[PDB]
Amino acid sequence: GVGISTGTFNNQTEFKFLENGWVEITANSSRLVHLNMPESENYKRVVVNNMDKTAVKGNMALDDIHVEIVTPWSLVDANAWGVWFNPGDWQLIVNTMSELHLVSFEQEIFNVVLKTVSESATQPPTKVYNNDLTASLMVALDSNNTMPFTPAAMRSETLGFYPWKPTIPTPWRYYFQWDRTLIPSHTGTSGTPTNVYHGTDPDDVQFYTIENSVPVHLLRTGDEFATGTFFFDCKPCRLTHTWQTNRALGLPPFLNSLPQSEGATNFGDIGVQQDKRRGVTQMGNTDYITEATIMRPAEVGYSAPYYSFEASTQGPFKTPIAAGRGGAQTDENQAADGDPRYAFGRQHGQKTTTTGETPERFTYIAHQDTGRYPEGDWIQNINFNLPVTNDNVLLPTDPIGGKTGINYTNIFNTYGPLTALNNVPPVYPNGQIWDKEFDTDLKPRLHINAPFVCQNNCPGQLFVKVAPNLTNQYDPDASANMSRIVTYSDFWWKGKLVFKAKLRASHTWNPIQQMSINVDNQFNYVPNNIGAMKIVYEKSQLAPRKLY
Amino acid sequence: GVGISTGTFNNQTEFKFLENGWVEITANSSRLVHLNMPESENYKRVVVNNMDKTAVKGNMALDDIHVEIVTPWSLVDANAWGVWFNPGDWQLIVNTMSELHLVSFEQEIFNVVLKTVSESATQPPTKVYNNDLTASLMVALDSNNTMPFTPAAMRSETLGFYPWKPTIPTPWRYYFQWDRTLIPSHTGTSGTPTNVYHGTDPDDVQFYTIENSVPVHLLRTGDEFATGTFFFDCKPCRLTHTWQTNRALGLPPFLNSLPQSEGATNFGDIGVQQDKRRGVTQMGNTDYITEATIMRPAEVGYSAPYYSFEASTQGPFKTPIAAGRGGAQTDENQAADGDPRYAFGRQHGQKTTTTGETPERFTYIAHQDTGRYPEGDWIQNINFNLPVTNDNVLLPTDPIGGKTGINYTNIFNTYGPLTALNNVPPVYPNGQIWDKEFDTDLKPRLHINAPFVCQNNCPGQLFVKVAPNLTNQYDPDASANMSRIVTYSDFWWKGKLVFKAKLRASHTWNPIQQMSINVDNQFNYVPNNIGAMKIVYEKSQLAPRKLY
Amino acid sequence: IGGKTGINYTNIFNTYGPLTALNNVPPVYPNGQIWDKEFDTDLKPRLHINAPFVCQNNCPGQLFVKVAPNLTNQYDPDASANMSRIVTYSDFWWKGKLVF
Amino acid sequence: VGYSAPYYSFEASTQGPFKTPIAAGRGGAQTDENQAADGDPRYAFGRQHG
Amino acid sequence: PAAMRSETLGFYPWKPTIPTPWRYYFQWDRTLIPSHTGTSGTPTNVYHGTDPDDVQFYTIENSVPVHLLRTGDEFATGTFFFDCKPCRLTHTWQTNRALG
């Protein structure tokens, strides 16, 4: 079966308009994947330890020590928006749809090829490449998710984003249990804190092998491998944002006095003394009904401690947060808090011809308003008694623990039974699409890395590896290290991801926000005179939705 | 039937998604119409003559003399985009659809009311208003289009554009035949040109009466009038523009030399001597194949004489043109040529609280590129022979007729059997929707005022009038002028216009142009502190389409 | 005209009108094109100057060909370089059938 | 039968000048070749096409 | 269409041929004011760039399904049936002067 193709290249997105404003989006994606034989045909338990860094007082957050099992397999990950949609498809979906549903997923591997490299080491000297017609490509599909879930989008290692650029898979590796202790300190700390890696707890040791837990297929040139169709189990993802705050929920106060002339300084007037008003409040001990005092249904968003690192049995880790935000976009300098930052390279959006090893990055700033402005928070004594007196207020300016740069807001947490919150928004093109749910008895209410989380069923990971091409001399009983003919493989990948979307409706008199090409961004969507390209990030929930 | 309503108020737009990316758009529009009794219950033949103006040499274009028949009826016109869609509906249609089809139209008149005004002329003195329960509102629907077609959008006189603002109909009047002669002149002209109104040609006289040619209904409070549904006869209207010029049609030249470094001055190079190239040309006498010389299929757009006034039996009139345009938008100062200019008032888009009698206006600048840049035109002798010599070129700089401000381009016309052209684009909210076809044997290939032209069938005009409320003293045999109780009427109007649209597809890698609200235009879509409003114009064909 | 010694009114002249009778373009052997695609404008040309046949609605689709990338053992998607690939070329036979 | 159009007329739009197209050319007693010009197509080709 | 630049398949059944590199036009604004030999100063000759509202970047991968053919493979287009008027192979010689 050498001279016969086993598949088709398809990278088209189809919209199929059903009934009742629901369309079916079929995203096809094909790619040529390049794969070299493993640097080692063995599994390894490698420890990483950068104590030299953290040894410097004040650097706890630069902790990198961990342990991982390095396997001789590669992972073919296509779980990122950029792998399926191009800028033009995203604009259509994001501008005209109101919500998204993830439906199916299926892959395929065809037109496999295995070449060999011979050192034509003559003068120059040289190199020769030849087909190894009887060689094999090993393929394993972990349908039962026996293996550790390792989504590549987290480290910018998924398949590439351009239909016409060959891509590659990533070396697979997973974490191995270890104990580590790191006591925090600051520049003025004395003596040496405590920074040790304790080793492994035998009761938490799990060494996984693909050979032992997954059936492997050997594909020769004439072979093809096709995953069946996987049908997802999820909630819909919204493509519209909310802008309401507790301050904009409900019936506003009745203005007994309205302006009578156009004018920036012509305001309306409630026209009633603040302690002589009517309405409901939750401050049982005052007569002041204010817009900051009046009672609202519940609470949109919450407060959490910031740049808080917690520690458990294997080192410090940052305390997660859902969303960030602020008022008049002090943007960028605005950033920080809980706005995701993505760093990527030449294959996932960075300008293709860019030299150097510095990645490209961006901080995604969502349209939703469900965050907090710490500088505006404050706490005061129940007696109320305005104007508040210094000993009766704790402002986000007063120090804590004596530290000049720490407030109570840094320690603060206002999550409770009244917290209303939104799931995470899609991030094009670098964001991950779906995630696997934690196998704990009590699960997170949402995942900070993907808008879709398969509870029960999640697609299995696909592993690939070039089978060993040994030379006439091979001795299993020797330390050496098997020597094998330099072999590599190229195969085509093809996936199909199906969504179900709901067409949007116009509910207000005014137009709304839409994604569009303009004089300014115009050149982020076309190649240059050298064929250089780049894929700029874009927002998903542009279009307000009322919350209450 | 006095205390019982005869209709419902509905001003909602519905999109009903059928099969195969085709949606059905139902636009409902309701309004409260106010109507006074006619200033005269008689038809009048009035002549307008402003010779004082045109008597001033050089003012021919300010000619206003005409003759019209002034009728005692009013017209209820709803043929303008603003009567059916609000900014939010337009953005949805314009951003997500690719073409429009006009399907039905139907109207209705309900909840009629007729009041009377009594001069409570006591001290202040005063006024009293009372219901005249037995009074009638006369309604006539000209289904067979017997009457002259007089679309109100041409003079900004259609129903209003805000669902919550009472509107009014316009006094109906039509043109009457007359002969007029006006000889052109300029500031330095001597003697007096010739500016006379000759009167009427008896063989062209047509005096129309609604009473004699249309059946009239008399509606009392308890009555309602409902037009059946009219189904249009038309072609589809496109919501995408073309950008290609003759210069961008076909296979571009093969570049034998491509850039090798990113850089504004790094150009490609055909790399072949101009008179040593291959391809086809229509200049049978040269060997130069240039991008301006190479042969193209036909010709996109044409040239016509500009600010050309022609004259026939009733005075001068401007020579019409389809579209205008230019390169790097020298915009506005760009304008002129054939870009429509709309002047309107408080009821159709002008800021509602604006004082004074000066209207609001705009020049619609289309996205399509099918116009000409006269400054770049030139004509040269067949011998060719470059560089062209002065006596062998006529530049749009060389004078004509000796006039320092006139070129050949002003006289120029290049319309022919190879002219490719586009129909006119929709103009929101002031543009007219449909038009009636000329009853000539050879019709225009398009109308410059509306994207839809019903050839065979066009909806009939609806006329309204308050029936005469006479006093105890009425004498038909006397010159006087009938005296009648001051009566007026208020009734609700309700229309339903149905379209059929085709959802758009994304055909390119790059995103495209979309209408959107931004920091700059944000306040054109919301009322102010006094309730002032305005309706800003918007473009319809934003989204390129390839022509060839 | 315009004072120019080498320009007439005929150079500016246009007599196209409602009475113009005209013929379509003639076939040119062997260099002439056979058919052409119609312009997607609302008002089309009465004829095309480059081909005697113009498919209004339906026109054959274009056929594109390309030699798929034959990479060497060294390929790095994340690098500026420019992929290096084994020098490959192709020869295939084409066969068409046009019926009149 | 036939019509008159401006000759060696170049018009301009948003992307540069282009020659005004014409349907057919011609003349009486074939002053042929020197006759040419007007609207008679000229074809330039190579070794593979003639 | 390649015939416009003399780039179609060859004309001899017994001579190997080749296809032409595909390329298409992209939108751009350019201004060139005409002049003649005696013109003074410098006319105006500038390339303004691209209008974002007319930008269309086409990729075959994204809009057309691609087939991969190995030696043992073949590709066959179905039959396309044209939509056109007939083409005449006879000329007219009459002028207004020879009508009637």
Added chain:
Amino acid sequence: MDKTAVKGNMALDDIHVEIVTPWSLVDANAWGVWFNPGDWQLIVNTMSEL
């Protein structure tokens, strides 16, 4: 522009922009690809329309 910079050379304008793709086109839309001189003579001499 070096060319058109020379007053009187407007018609030698070549400036344009094009997207260069990595694909090739197989075009057979020309009379010579289908008929040889002998076939053309037969069609042209004995037929009246095509």
Added chain:
Amino acid sequence: LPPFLNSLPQSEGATNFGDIGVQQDKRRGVTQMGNTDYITEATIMRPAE
């Protein structure tokens, strides 16, 4: 997915560690600290907590 080690040990040994081999502020991945370029094992983004 743990970080990709650009440098692996070559001898058995308690002090023979692997090495990410990339400057901390020149790495790729996702973080929730919108205002820094440091992608660390204590900084990198995890699904939840």
